[PDB]
Design a protein around this ligand. Structure first.
Ligand SMILES: [Zn+2]
Length: 46
């Protein structure tokens, strides 16, 4: 779907939660931690 053409470099593993690119699949997962702790109780208001 999304536009995909040869040009700029894109990380092989990107967070599907926020959209952070990483050169290592391991690192990405680690960051996923901050995602497993949502805060539905705050001004977040979505
Ligand atoms: Zn993320």
């Amino acid at each position: 779907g999304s536009s995909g053409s040869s040009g700029t470099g894109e990380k092989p593993y990107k967070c599907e939660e926020c959209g952070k690119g990483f050169i290592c699949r391991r690192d990405l997962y680690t960051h996923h931690m901050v995602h497993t702790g949502e805060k539905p109780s705050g001004p977040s208001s979505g």
